[PDB]
């Protein structure tokens, strides 16, 4: 049981990254740019009504 719950949690950690951005320690080394690209026309802010 312990091993199955171990693999279940680490699987959920991977899925959480695809659901939202997660802090992962910040910058490591020289800044190498946005690796997956910048989207000019997309906004993710939560807008107050």
């Amino acid at each position: 049981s312990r091993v199955k719950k171990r693999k279940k949690y680490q699987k959920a950690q991977k899925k959480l990254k695809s659901v939202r951005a997660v802090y992962s320690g910040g910058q490591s080394g020289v800044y190498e740019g946005e690796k997956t690209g910048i989207k000019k026309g997309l906004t993710r802010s939560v807008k107050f009504k």
């Binding site: 910040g26 800044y31 740019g33 946005e34 690209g37 026309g41 993710r44 802010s45 807008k47 107050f48």
Partner: protein, 241 residues
């Protein structure tokens, strides 16, 4: 990644005064007000324009919280070319210099700092940038520098203080134009480490509403920062309803 001899394509962002450098990786870049030098060691890009050698600077999201806001997808920034911006908590030119680039020659930047040791470099940086006015004064007492500042289109506050809501309150009333912009960077730990971050953000927004500032949007700065959010609002003196 973004090595020396690499070649990139520079295109404009949705926000005026901000650009994107395409390639194997994308970079947020702003046109260099003072070509040929770096404020804090950021990478720079030169373009041969008919010829004059124009230069661009890289904006690192992990160093500037405003840059992190652009990456996360803020909808509206009141910081734009030809506008006066009152920058509170300007520790040094890490983020003010990039703001000075956006406003351009026609705009001005009123950089307010309290500590003298960061202040000294802010003076030295300001002399490369004619459009930056350094004000080495405490932001908790705007009356001290009322002579120095006129009306400003936007107010940007990065002060990491428990009473930043009052600091933003007083400065906006004196200098911010009606229907002007307000941009706040809130770090939960400085304000109240006892409670969770969500409680702190809800509390700061309520204070801004009390101060006739209508919040427009909120964004958290992950993965660049933890327990941070940028709140973008408008100063509606007439009424928020």
């Amino acid at each position: 990644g973004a090595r020396g001899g690499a070649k990139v394509v520079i295109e404009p962002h949705r926000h005026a005064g901000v650009y994107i450098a395409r390639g194997k990786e994308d970079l947020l870049v702003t046109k260099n007000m003072a070509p040929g030098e770096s404020v804090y060691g950021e990478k720079r890009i030169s373009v041969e324009e008919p010829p004059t050698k124009v230069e661009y600077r890289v904006w690192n999201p992990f160093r500037s919280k405003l840059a992190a806001g652009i990456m996360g997808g803020l909808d509206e920034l009141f910081i734009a070319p030809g506008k006066k911006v009152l920058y509170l908590g300007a520790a040094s030119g890490t983020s003010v210099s990039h703001v000075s680039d956006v406003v351009g020659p026609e705009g001005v930047v009123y950089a307010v700092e309290f500590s003298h040791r960061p202040g000294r470099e802010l003076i030295s940086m300001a002399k490369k940038r004619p459009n930056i006015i350094p004000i080495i004064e405490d932001a908790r007492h705007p009356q001290k520098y009322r002579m120095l500042i006129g009306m400003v289109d936007c107010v940007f506050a990065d002060v990491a203080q428990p009473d930043q809501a009052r600091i933003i309150a007083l400065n906006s009333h004196m200098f911010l134009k009606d229907q002007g912009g307000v941009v706040i960077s809130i770090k939960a730990n400085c304000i109240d480490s006892t409670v969770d971050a969500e409680t702190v953000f809800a509390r700061e927004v309520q204070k801004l509403r009390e101060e006739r500032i209508k919040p427009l949007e909120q964004l958290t700065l992950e993965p660049y920062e933890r327990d941070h959010c940028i709140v973008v609002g408008r100063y509606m003196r007439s009424g928020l309803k």
